[PDB]
């Protein structure tokens, strides 16, 4: 089965074979489709297709709701109705059979998304928001006009929202481990902390188990142990921004006495039910105002990282030890100890199907 859409006027129609285009890091799946035209109802002499990755965001200074500012990240276009001799490409398996079904008045089009481009990520809108989805999104548009720059009419075009998604790699990386050794003023004996996760890769909804080991040889007791999962998002719209948002946390009232060790295993599971109030939290790209999970980690193209546009999402686990205060300095120094563990949060490769939009609808 394939998806189709028609213009409000009804004389133009564009077909797509899917909505989620997988990104294999090295090369993205081609975007292919078939446009159904009507030459007698089309004296414009041209029909155009367009692919556009755009950053859309609601202004803060502007008091008007619904209106958003938009910026192009990558734009491509194609001639479709008059067969362009210079734009010849071989037809795909689905495209040729769509031509066979629809007949003469149906023409193909194909794009190729270049690598190192953002994946569809939607920032979570607050309850007071009313406009369209914010963040990075892709859109396929087919229209008719005597020239590229001629004013576009809403009734003479179609538009579909498509996504560029990534799935978990086939093999996990090395187990993430990290440690630190804090040395205090009073004595030459250090406070040692280690942590590690079971595996590098985690799926959405799968619980994260954190292993904590403490070797306290100092004269200060540990008051509390705090574990949290934080979502790191980098935005490179004009200049590189950076924000951190915690998505799950656990505080344990565990204490370590001097010259004593301690070991425990904590469990956490990031999920969206208890993060509804956090405005600006990054979520997977939405086609409409549906519900989607937390944004999956973006796989960078190894050592390229040429300030990828849009939003780059990554996760870490932070283990923090609260140390007692007093003595000479008291409340003036920073006695706490911390360490961070990075990990990957992604979907597995679907067997045959692409995602489905709120499968049991309300």
């Amino acid at each position, epitope marked *: 089965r394939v998806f189709k859409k028609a213009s409000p006027n009804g004389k133009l129609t564009v077909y797509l074979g899917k909505r989620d285009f997988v990104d294999h890091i090295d090369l993205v799946d081609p975007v292919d489709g078939v446009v159904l035209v009507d030459p007698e109802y089309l004296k414009e002499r041209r029909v155009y297709v367009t692919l556009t990755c755009a950053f859309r965001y609601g202004r803060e200074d502007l008091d008007v709701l619904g209106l958003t500012f938009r910026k192009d990240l990558f734009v491509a276009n194609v001639q479709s109705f008059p067969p362009a001799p210079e734009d010849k490409k071989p037809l795909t398996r689905l495209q040729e059979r769509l031509i066979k079904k629809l007949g003469e008045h149906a023409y193909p089009f194909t794009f190729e998304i270049p690598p190192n481009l953002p994946c569809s990520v939607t920032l979570q809108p607050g309850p007071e928001d009313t406009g369209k989805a914010c963040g990075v999104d892709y859109e396929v548009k087919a229209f008719c006009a005597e020239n590229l720059e001629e004013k576009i009419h809403k009734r003479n075009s179609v538009r579909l929202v498509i996504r560029k998604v990534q799935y978990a790699p086939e093999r996990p990386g090395p187990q993430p481990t990290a440690e630190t050794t804090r040395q205090f003023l009073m004595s030459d004996k250090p406070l040692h902390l280690e942590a590690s996760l079971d595996k590098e890769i985690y799926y*959405h909804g799968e*619980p994260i188990s954190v292993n904590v080991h403490v070797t306290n040889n100092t004269n200060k007791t540990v008051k509390k142990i705090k574990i949290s999962v934080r979502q790191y998002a980098d935005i490179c719209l004009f200049n590189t921004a950076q924000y951190k948002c915690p998505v799950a946390m656990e505080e344990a009232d565990d204490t370590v006495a001097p010259s004593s060790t301690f070991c425990k295993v904590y469990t956490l599971t990031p999920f969206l*039910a208890n993060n*509804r109030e956090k405005r600006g939290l990054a979520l997977d790209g939405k086609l409409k105002h549906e519900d989607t999970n937390l944004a999956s980690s973006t796989l960078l193209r190894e050592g390229a990282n040429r300030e990828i546009l849009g939003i780059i999402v990554s996760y870490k686990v932070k283990v923090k030890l609260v140390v007692s205060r007093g003595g000479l300095l008291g409340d003036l120094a920073s006695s706490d100890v911390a360490v961070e563990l990075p990990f990957t949060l992604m*979907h597995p490769k679907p067997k045959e*199907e692409p995602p*489905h939009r709120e*499968v049991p609808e309300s």
Partner: antibody
Amino acid sequence: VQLVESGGGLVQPGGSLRLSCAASGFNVYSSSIHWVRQAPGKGLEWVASISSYYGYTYYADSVKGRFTISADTSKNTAYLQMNSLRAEDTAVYYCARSRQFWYSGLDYWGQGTLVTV
Amino acid sequence: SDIQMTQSPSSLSASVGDRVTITCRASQSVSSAVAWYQQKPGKAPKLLIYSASSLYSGVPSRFSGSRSGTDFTLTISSLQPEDFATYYCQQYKYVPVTFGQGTKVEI
């Protein structure tokens, strides 16, 4: 991996019962747990649902207000609280599980508990 | 909105090795979101098909499902002696999720 439920038994109309379904091999955040009942000799019928990742609960129109569903994450158990059990609420209840990402049918079922009113 | 999934025949009889076709019709369009289950008397239903054409893992290949508009069909290429059970047809696109009335396959 297996689902098992307990709590069903004889009861008088208008009373209350607790059905608890214990999940093993998967966690309630990554799965959506449903309750499906089958009247004696009749076809299957869906009664309740819960999705712990998004925090949503759904009930059939015939049991809205009477039943209430909750899941406790600490031990991967889903509870169905039945109140004001009418005479027609007798059936064999199955605990079912469907993938949260994404729904692809009820692949795992319970063993079947009986509620007689 | 609720969707009544009229499923016929209510019960049929067939011999070993015969080809059996079961029809399930929806009152409204449900896309390809239809699942098939098999229940033997007294036991929990076992899932067979999801997305109306995709075989569930571990199910023998003789089971197949097809779609034609809103008429969904389950077909068994060669009916093995263990297949004589009750089949239920489910649509999972709209809450409430409605099952078919069910068909019985008997010797």
